[PDB]
Design a protein around this ligand. Structure first.
Ligand SMILES: C[C@@H]1[C@H]([C@H](C=O)[C@@H](C)O)N=C(C(=O)O)[C@@H]1S[C@@H]1CN[C@H](C(=O)N(C)C)C1
Length: 269
């Protein structure tokens, strides 16, 4: 079949890193894939916020005024790493602005406000089930969901399910066309991923992504849609973890894993 037609040295990369690397990459033209630990669970960390914004967009298809609704919040809503929402504490922000901040700056207060609107972790999980993702689970609220405990399935997904859901939302039919392009535009505008998948992608190709970094257990990640010129887009996810709480994550390992995935698919970059 079309999985791992060309072998790549993922095992040496993760051994040098001192942990585990999980990769799934899909060439949406031919259906060829690269897969390494692709069905293992890894912590989502902040990467859940991309799917949160897609769930908001889905709701907006049946609530025409949702995106422009102004949301006010108190100082108690501001938690560490809320770089956009802290600048609008005294004014409020719209649902769309909160969604953009959650995707593009990983804004934590914004993500918490939107998670509340959707009915909490079970509400986001229900949205993912509604698009056919049976792997994703969000269980806790922010700044508890990033514990990344070895063997704990809470607040995890697999690289494969992340990629499959990302494809459905950005390129498939899970969102209506205007909402689909809005999701793509938010991902393209991300500011936090320059040293991850984007570092493996030539400058003349379009790319959108969402990052995550738990801060413990060498756990960090990135997922992306990439548009190489002259061929069909590629969807991919790269997740890492490591055995010890104080093990450090590595952005360079994520970029290197993305390069290996593109090489395995025969995409010249
Ligand atoms: C803290 C942000 C947030 C995160 C989600 O994973 C949640 C748990 O706060 N999202 C971020 C993302 O850029 O994705 C950033 S972590 C980034 C990697 N080192 C930087 C740093 O100063 N650290 C606290 C780790 C920024």
């Amino acid at each position: 079949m079309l999985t791992n037609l060309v072998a790549e040295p993922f095992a040496k990369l993760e051994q040098d890193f001192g942990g585990s690397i999980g990769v799934y990459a899909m060439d949406t033209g031919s259906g060829a894939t690269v897969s390494y630990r692709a069905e293992e669970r890894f912590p989502l960390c902040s990467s859940f916020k991309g799917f949160l914004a897609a769930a908001v967009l889905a709701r907006s298809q049946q609530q025409a005024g949702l995106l422009d609704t102004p949301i006010r919040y108190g100082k108690n809503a501001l938690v560490p790493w809320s770089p956009i929402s802290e600048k609008y504490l005294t004014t409020g922000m719209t649902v769309a602005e909160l969604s953009a901040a959650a995707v593009q700056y990983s804004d934590n207060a914004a993500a918490n406000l939107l998670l509340k609107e959707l009915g909490g972790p079970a509400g986001l999980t229900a949205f993912m089930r509604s698009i056919g993702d049976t792997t994703f689970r969000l269980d806790r609220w922010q700044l508890e969901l990033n514990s990344a405990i070895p063997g704990d399935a809470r607040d995890t997904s697999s690289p494969r399910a992340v990629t499959e859901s990302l494809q459905k939302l950005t390129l498939g039919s899970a969102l209506a066309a205007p909402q689909r392009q809005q999701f793509v535009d938010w991902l393209k505008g991300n500011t936090t991923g320059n040293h991850r998948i984007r570092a493996a992608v030539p400058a003349d190709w379009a790319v959108g992504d969402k990052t995550g970094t738990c801060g413990v257990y060498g756990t960090a990640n990135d997922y992306a849609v990439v548009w190489p010129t002259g061929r069909a887009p590629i969807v991919l996810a790269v997740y890492t973890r490591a055995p010890n709480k104080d093990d450090k994550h590595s952005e360079a390992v994520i970029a290197a894993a993305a390069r290996l995935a593109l090489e395995g698919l025969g995409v010249n970059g």
